[PDB]
Every structure is written in C-alpha cells, then in structure tokens.
Ligand binder design. Structure first.
Ligand SMILES: CC(C)(COP(=O)(O)OP(=O)(O)OC[C@H]1O[C@@H](n2cnc3c(N)ncnc32)[C@H](O)[C@@H]1OP(=O)(O)O)[C@@H](O)C(=O)NCCC(=O)NCCS
Ligand SMILES: CC(C)(COP(=O)(O)OP(=O)(O)OC[C@H]1O[C@@H](n2cnc3c(N)ncnc32)[C@H](O)[C@@H]1OP(=O)(O)O)[C@@H](O)C(=O)NCCC(=O)NCCS
Lengths: 589, 336, 56
C-alpha cells in the first residue's frame, strides 16, 4: 500500500457529496474490519449536526464542525483531509487543511478548480512537505487497509476486485472510472491491487505519476504498476524518463488514450513510444492490458515473487434493510399503528375504499367525504342532506364564544392560522360545543331506561352526572329562541322519513327544564346529538360535527383579525377583579 | 479556452496594453455572423503558463519571419506569484536586442502582459506582431491570441464572452442541445458528430469513451460520433443523449460501453438509455442496428437485466458484464 | 385538480401555469420536486382572487 493505510484517519470537508463518500468508506471499513476512517465533517451550513453513518449494521454518529480547528482539537487523530466542496471554496479549504500541522495528505474530488489555484496549492504542499492529490481525484484505495473517497464503487465490487486483501499491483490513473476498471483487471488477471490512485484529469495535478511511482518502488508489496494515461501534458513522458533513469524493481504496464490521430509533443503515440522504449509493457489497445497483467503475474509466479496462497477468508456481507427482510417474511415487525379509514399508498387516497377524485367526478360532496372517513360507509341522500345542514348551521356563532374568542386572541397575538385555530378548538368541551356525544348517550339511555319518566331521568342525572348535556344556553332562552334548533328539528320532522325517539324525548325534557329556568332550552349540542343518535352514527363521531363545523367559524375569525391588522389584546384592567392577597414582606430564608 | 480577438483586446485594454482601435459588429476580419474592423517594426511577445508559473518569450523578429528566427527568442520563467520587476523585463528586452528607450517601453508592456496573465486566469497570451510606430513611439498589439481558464469565470464578472469551438467548425443543433443539457445538470453529457461513420458510441466516462474510439479506429472501423456521459447524470439527460445517437445517419452498431462505475447508478442511467432506445425504435430509427452493451457499476445487475429484457421487444441487443474485457465488444461488432 | 381547472372551466390561471412550468425545471433537478397539493391549491385560489390570509 502507499498513501492510505490502517493508520489513516480522515476529516471530510464538504456537504452531501462528502457524506456519500463517508458512507462508502464505512462499507469498506466494515469489509476489512477496521474502525471508521471518517472522524469528523467540516461544513459550516450544517455545523453542530451529526451524520448517521452505518458501519455494516452498526450506526455511527459523526459530528459536523464549523471549521477545521475545532474538528482537529476534538479529533487530534486526523491526518487526512478530503475536499468535497465546489470550485469556488475547494482551494481555500485545501489551503486550510495543508496549513494544519496534523494533516499530511489532502485529496480533492472537485472539478473546475482554477489552474492558478491548483498551481498555488501544489507550491504550498511542497513548501510544507505535504501530499496533495487531485483536484478531480475520485480517491485513493489501499486493498485491505483504507479507502479514501467513492473509488471502488458498490460493496459487491469490493469483493469482486478482492479489495479486502493486498495483491501485487499498483494502479495509477488520471481517469476515475478507469481506476475501477484497472482494479478489476488486476483481480481478474493478477492477484489484485496494493494501492489504486486516481491523480485527477486536471492540467496541473497536485502530485504527478513519477511522485507516485517513486512511492510504489519503495513499497515491497507492489511488484508492478498499471498506469492509465491519455493525450495532453508530459506526465507520462516524465514517467518513461523515471523508468529509464535507473534500474527499477517494479514493472510498468501502461495504456494511453488518444490514438485518434486519424480524426480531429503530448501525443498518445509519442507517450506509448517513450514508455515502450523505457521498458514498459504497452498494449496496442485497452483490451491488451488484461494480457499484459497476465504476462507480468505469470513471470512473478515463476520468479517466486508471488505465492499461490488461496483466499482463506469468510467475508462479511452487508446487512439488508428491514423492508427487504419483511418482503421475504424473515423478520416480525409489529406495526406502531393500525389505520382502517384511508390508504394514501396509491396514486391518490382511497377513503373507505373509494378513490378521492372518483368521488368528485361522480358528483359527491364534502358531506359524503365526512360519512366515508367517519362511518366507513357512503351516506344516503337523506343522511348526506342532514350532515350538510348540521355543518352549515353550526359553522359560527359570533366572536363572544370561547372557541371563536380563543382564535381571535391567538390571531391578535400574531399566531399563524393552524396554531390559532388549535387554541380555539381546545375550548370545545363539556361547556362549549363538546356535549354532542354525551347528549346522544344520555338521551338514548333516557329513551331505554326512563321512557315515561322524565322526572326520574332528571333526578338520576342531577345525582350522577350534574347538568344535563345538551340543555341550557347563556343567551338563548324561551323568550329568545335558538332558530338553529327550531330549523334542524323542523327539517328532520317535516322534510325527512327519519323516526327520532331521542329527539322526541329531548324535546319533552326541554318542556320540563324550561319550566324550572327559561334558559334551560335544548341547545345545538343536544339537538345534533339526538338527530345523529337516531341516524345510528357511531357514538365517538358525534362531537366531530361541532369540531369540524366550528373550525369554519374559527378560521373565519382568524382571517378577519388579520385583514383588520388587529393589535395584541391585553384585557382591560376595569374588567378584572384582583381579589389578591394583601401585600407582604418576604421573610428571610 | 480560446477566446475571440475582440474579448482579448478588451482585457488588453483593461490592463493598459497597446491595442489598435477596433469595433465589433482599416481592416476587416470575421469573429459567419460577426465582423471586426480595426485600424491598420514588428516584435513577438507570448506568455505561456506551466506547472511552475509561466514563461515569457520575447523576440525582436516579429511577424511571419519568427519561424526561422527562433534563436532570436529570449525566454524567462516567471515563478508563480514571484513576478519580475520592470528593470528585469527591461534587461530581458536588452538581451533580445532592444536598446535604451524602447527596452524600458517593451519591459513596461511585458509587465502589463504579466499582470493581465496573472489577473485574468490565462493559460497563454500570444502577440505577433507587437508593432512600434517609431515617429511618436506608439505601440500596438496587432494579432492577439488569448487562452483563458474558463472554469475560473465565477471570479470574473467582466467576462461577457463565451469560448471558441474546440473543433474548427462551430456546433450543430444536436450538439448545442447536448451542451445546454450539460450546463443545467450536475453530471456531464457531451456529444460530437463525426462526418459519416458506421459505429456509434454511447459510452460512460471520458477516459473509457476515448479508449472505445481508439479501439474502433485501430480495428479498421469508423466512428459515427463521440459521446460521453459521466458523474451520475440524470436519466432524462442520458435519454436525450441516447435519442440523439439513434437519430444519426447510416449507423450499423451502437456501442453502449464503459468501465466499472464508482458512483454512477447503472440502473438509473440504463433506464434513460432504455427509454431513449424504445422512443427511437417506435419512430423507426433502430431498424437492423445491433446494440452492444458492456458495463459495470452500482446496480449493474438490475440495469443489465433491464437492458437484456429489450431482447423480447425485438432489439438485436448483446449485453455483457465485466468478464468481457472493456473494448472487446468493438471486436465482436467489427466481426458482424 | 389541474385537469378539472383546465378541462372543466375556461379559467385563466397564470399562477398555476407558472407553477406547472417551474415543476418541469425542479423535477429535472430531483424527481421528488413535484408541484404538491399546497402549491396546487395555493395557485388555484390565488387565480380565483381569494384573500391571501384565507389560503391555508
Ligand atoms: C461534488 C460536487 C458536486 C460538490 O460540490 P457542490 O454542490 O458545489 O458543493 P458545495 O457544498 O460547495 O455546494 C452546495 C451549496 O452549499 C453552499 N455552501 C457550501 N459551503 C458553504 C459555506 N461555508 N457557507 C455557505 N454556503 C456554503 C454553496 O454555495 C452551494 O450553494 P449554491 O449552489 O446556491 O451556490 C462538486 O464539487 C463537483 O462538481 N465535483 C465533481 C463531480 C464529482 O466527482 N462528484 C463526486 C460525487 S461523490
Ligand atoms: C349553574 C346552575 C346549576 C345554578 O342553578 P340556580 O339558578 O342557582 O338554581 P337551581 O340550582 O335551583 O337551578 C334551577 C333548576 O334547574 C336545574 N338545572 C340547572 N342547570 C341545568 C342543566 N344544565 N340541565 C338540567 N337541569 C339543570 C337544577 O337542577 C334545578 O332543578 P331542581 O328543581 O331539580 O332543583 C344553573 O343556572
């Protein structure tokens, strides 16, 4: 191996691209059974957050720092920086990393880094005696030891290219996609790789071919190097100069792209000729490269430099996602919730089995959607017409009522509509609008247990529940009738075929209660409660009609106060009775 | 990135470099849709960038006669951010053969050129000739050849220009359409039309694309086009590229090749290729054409299985995995 | 909703038309950047000239 080893600990400077690199590096760390290479992330937009990175099936939380100084302070361990930032920020981040005394190697994936910036960074890395790889480098891969970047692809590829143990071949490419092809060629025709380095495709790489060839020459494990170059520059010429200059231990296998000298100094024929003359194994096409690797590998077996020691390893496999195991029925997942009313999993929601848009097209209304979601049955025209009227008649009853006033208070406190309406909806309960369910229950119980005994029902209620749910009003009375209840009752009794025993009973108790106190009228809660109980709607659903209806009013009041640009309400002093304790001195503790 | 005469002159002007009065709409050259008109001893000046900075080449023998007069050329190496002083440049001029008043003048010009190079992210600037009108001592840069590093554009808000075409001729409709697609996307899509050619390339990555083209030429074949797609491009862009390749005249084989991708999803990109093959086949474009597939990369099983299904739709498609050497599908195609 | 407004009314919906064009650009960036129900209702109601406060 040459630059990355089991002692390499990285800091990734970049965002989502950096996190994807880290996730790939974690897969390698799982395969070769080593601790996580990524120690930290440096990304000011996400500073303070933690990234969840899986090392196999184990979740690792990696911290995101604002800058490099706190990252290295918290992780002195770090000796490598990977730059995953865009062109406008990459060079400054690379400068910061090179100037950090802990960092020895800086690699850049970034494309479009100005030549002037790459030249300045190469000069700085030389002054400081540090290694700079890239820009435009997919990474560095040391088989069985370390992966820096996305180099090596999917987990199945790491296994196919035998990247879990050291081979005898080094890989040097300009091209990212071709380092992965070279790694495969070495596994397929040789014994795998030691290290693979993508130097980058930029005019001025941080480290050239000779710099890496010098390092490979000093690595005892590397017996040959597969170098993949192309037309442009003299990086391959300088490598041929390096090979010719002295007797080298490593064999050089080279393929040069750009022999398109039939279609429109740094020529691919001039590079192939320099290398061939220097003693390198140069094939005529990229296809011949597999044959050159087999040639060198067979020489190495014969010359006793490679041992035929079979791959004695039971390799770890990537854990499946819970959904995969579930599909196969190989795991039991007890659901968190059960829903029976709607399915959103298709192209559109299905309410009680019916497609939402199909209901619109076929002429159904809001009242029909209420019945589907609350009763799981499409209402009948009669039912639908009653639901419609209950909602319309209950929609609003001015601003003085708790629910509406709650919304107005929140609207004036500068609260957004959903939150302001939630405060008003909190007021719906035993005293305001939320006696629909209990009115239904107690009047049905009266019909069953006290059919011809209203004083018995009333005595039982006084002793056991208190005031009768559905009876009484603060402003409406016998002298000031509630036309809302008169309207609903006359609709049910004169415009429908519905037999209403609860409503009939409730209307009789109203005659008795209003004889006691004129305000003890059957109210909207009691009226809706009885009508719905007589329609045989589920008992739980009864308060829904008020809650839903009064939401129309509550949103109305919120919109109104906003259109008025209402200021914060602070209740007037003269309206408060401060029946407070006399003022007193606090005793010493 | 080679830039036009006008733009180059504008930057010269900016860094105070003697330039003839010009107008872009007396001499008349073309930038055909644009024409330049500028007012009309000779010297040679050029600053060519290198790994260590740049090199300033100077000659007293300017104009056409510079080819034989290459011994007359005095060159100095400007180390990165270690720019020479005016006197050094005057001495440099003096070494060339420049005397007294002009040497300083030449030296001063050089510094401006050096400032222009440093500050404009240039790769190279070539002035031949840099003329002198001795009567009044007025200098003018007659022929301005400037290459700038276009990746650096974000640092330059004054760069109201686009770079000149790689191939001598400007781009066709398909071409410009593919360049538009590339600019909008995070990935990369490149398309170049080769006049004629029986073998059409739809290859992944610049490095692998070049090796596939070399393989075709080496095997006696003719390339119908040059097409590269890399950096996990969006399926639609890949579909756009596939569609363009299928529209090509007199193509016998399609080479859907590439190396083993490190991050490009082969299932996503192959769905874009498949969609574009289906789109092209329904329009009657892929009649008789054989498709050759060889690919590796994340989700290669799924993408390769999806592409081999295209056999039941009547496509003459041969799909191979990594075991098939990369450019060896070109042989199988040449033999057919 | 879009099909209902386009095929069953003769309404001119400039906000919805614009939103549908940006959806072509955004879904080209990431496939999940579709015009959702919020955007659809928002645009339809703005085009009907309903008070801005009422939209949510
Ligand atoms: C990999 C690559 C896409 C990452 O670059 P990117 O998206 O430009 O990365 P950034 O984190 O710099 O940019 C994302 C945004 O964050 C912003 N940002 C980044 N750092 C920031 C900071 N410190 N403060 C504020 N904003 C910041 C950027 O301005 C940008 O927003 P914008 O698009 O509106 O300008 C890019 O560098 C590239 O093209 N690489 C080549 C392709 C490649 O090899 N990819 C590897 C895939 S693993
Ligand atoms: C708050 C409240 C309970 C106070 O009552 P009050 O006016 O001070 O005097 P009472 O308690 O005697 O109320 C009058 C009667 O109406 C009854 N009543 C009061 N609120 C009632 C309600 N919401 N539902 C049914 N009966 C009610 C009382 O029980 C009493 O009847 P009684 O003959 O059985 O004693 C009411 O008003």
């Amino acid at each position: 191996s040459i630059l990355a080893n089991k002692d390499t600990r990285a800091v990734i400077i970049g965002g989502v691209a950096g996190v994807n690199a880290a996730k790939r590096m974690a897969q390698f760390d799982f395969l070769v059974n080593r601790p996580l290479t990524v120690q930290a992330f440096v990304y000011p937009p996400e500073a303070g957050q933690q990234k969840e990175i899986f090392r196999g099936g184990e979740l690792k939380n990696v911290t995101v720092y604002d800058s490099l100084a706190p990252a290295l302070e918290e992780h002195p361990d770090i000796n490598t920086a990977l730059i995953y930032l865009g062109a406008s920020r990459a060079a400054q981040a690379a400068k910061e990393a090179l100037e950090s005394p802990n960092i020895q190697l800086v690699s850049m994936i970034t494309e479009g880094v100005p030549e002037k910036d790459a030249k300045r960074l190469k000069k700085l890395a030389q002054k400081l005696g540090k290694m700079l790889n890239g820009p435009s480098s997919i990474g560095i891969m040391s088989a069985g030891e370390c992966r820096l970047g996305v180099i090596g692809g999917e987990f199945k590829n790491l296994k196919l290219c035998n990247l879990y143990r050291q081979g005898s071949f080094g890989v040097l490419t300009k091209s990212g996609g071709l380092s992965n092809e070279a790694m495969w060629l070495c596994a397929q025709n040789g014994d795998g790789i030691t290290s693979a380095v993508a130097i980058g495709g930029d005019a001025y790489p941080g480290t050239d071919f000779v710099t890496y060839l010098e390092m490979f020459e000093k690595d005892p494990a590397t017996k040959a190097v597969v170098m993949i170059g192309e037309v442009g520059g003299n990086l391959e010429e300088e490598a041929a100069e390096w090979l010719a200059a002295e007797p080298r231990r490593i064999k050089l296998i080279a393929a040069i792209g750009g022999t398109c000298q039939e279609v429109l100094a740094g020529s691919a024929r001039s590079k192939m000729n320099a290398l061939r003359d220097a003693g390198a194994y140069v094939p005529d096409t990229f296809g011949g490269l597999s044959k050159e690797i087999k040639k060198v590998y067979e020489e190495l077996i014969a010359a006793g430099e490679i041992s035929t020691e079979i791959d004695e390893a039971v390799l770890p496999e990537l854990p499946p996602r819970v959904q995969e195991v579930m599909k196969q029925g190989e795991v039991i997942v007890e659901p968190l919730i059960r829903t029976t009313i709607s399915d959103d999993r298709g192209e559109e929601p299905r309410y009680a089995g019916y497609a939402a848009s199909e209901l619109c097209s076929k002429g159904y209304g809001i009242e029909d959607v209420i019945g589907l979601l609350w009763n799981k049955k499409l209402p009948t025209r009669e039912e639908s017409e009653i639901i419609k009227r209950i909602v319309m008649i209950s929609a609003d009853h001015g601003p003085a009522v708790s629910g509406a006033f709650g919304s107005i208070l929140a609207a004036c406190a500068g609260i957004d509509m959903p939150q302001a309406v939630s405060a008003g909806m909190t007021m719906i309960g035993p005293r305001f609008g939320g006696a629909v369910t209990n009115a239904g229950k107690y009047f049905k119980m009266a019909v069953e247990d006290y059919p011809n005994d209203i004083p018995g029902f009333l005595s039982w209620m006084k002793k056991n529940v208190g005031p009768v749910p559905g009876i009484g009003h603060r402003v409406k009375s016998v002298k000031n009738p509630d036309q809302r209840v008169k309207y609903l009752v006359s609709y049910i009794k004169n415009e429908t075929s519905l037999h209403t025993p609860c409503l009939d009973y409730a209307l009789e108790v109203e005659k008795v209660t209003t004889a006691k106190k004129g305000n003890l009228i059957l109210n909207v809660d009691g009226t809706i409660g009885c009508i719905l109980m007589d329609l045989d709607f589920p008992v739980h659903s009864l308060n829904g009609f008020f809650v839903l209806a009064r939401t129309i009013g509550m949103i109305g009041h919120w919109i109104d106060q906003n259109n008025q640009n209402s200021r914060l309400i602070r209740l007037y002093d003269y309206l408060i009775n401060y029946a407070v304790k006399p003022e007193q001195e606090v005793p010493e503790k | 990135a080679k830039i036009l005469e006008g733009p180059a002159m504008k930057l010269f002007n900016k860094w105070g470099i003697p330039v003839p009065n010009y107008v872009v709409i007396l001499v008349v050259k073309a930038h055909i849709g644009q024409v330049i008109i500028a007012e009309m001893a000779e010297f040679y000046v050029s600053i060519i960038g290198n790994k260590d900075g740049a090199e300033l080449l100077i000659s007293k023998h300017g104009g056409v006669d510079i080819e034989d007069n290459w011994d007359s050329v005095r060159r100095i190496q400007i180390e990165l951010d270690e720019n020479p002083t005016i006197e050094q440049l005057t001495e440099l001029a003096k070494d060339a053969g420049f005397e007294g008043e002009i040497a300083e003048r030449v030296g001063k010009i050089c510094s401006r050129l050096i400032l222009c190079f440093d500050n404009e992210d240039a790769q190279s600037i070539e002035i031949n000739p840099l003329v002198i009108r001795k009567s009044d001592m007025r200098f003018a840069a007659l022929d301005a050849v400037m290459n700038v590093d276009y990746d650096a554009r974000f640092r330059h808000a004054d760069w109201d220009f686009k770079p000149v075409s790689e191939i001598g001729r400007p781009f066709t409709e398909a071409e410009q359409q593919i360049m538009e697609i590339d600019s909008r996307i995070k990935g990369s899509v490149k398309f170049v039309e080769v006049p004629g050619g029986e073998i059409a390339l739809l290859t992944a990555g610049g490095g692998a694309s070049v090796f596939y083209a070399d393989a075709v030429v080496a095997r006696g074949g003719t390339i119908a086009n040059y097409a590269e797609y890399s950096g996990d491009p969006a399926d639609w862009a890949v579909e756009a590229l596939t569609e363009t390749i299928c529209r090509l005249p007199n193509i016998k084989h399609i080479i859907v090749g590439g190396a083993i991708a490190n991050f490009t999803d082969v299932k996503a990109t192959f769905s874009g290729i498949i969609n574009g093959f289906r789109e092209s086949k329904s329009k009657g474009y892929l009649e008789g054409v054989k498709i050759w597939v060889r690919r590796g990369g994340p989700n290669e099983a799924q993408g390769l299985a999806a592409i081999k299904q295209l056999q039941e739709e009547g496509f003459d498609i041969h799909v191979y995995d990594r075991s098939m050497p990369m450019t060896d599908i070109v042989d199988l195609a040449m033999k057919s």
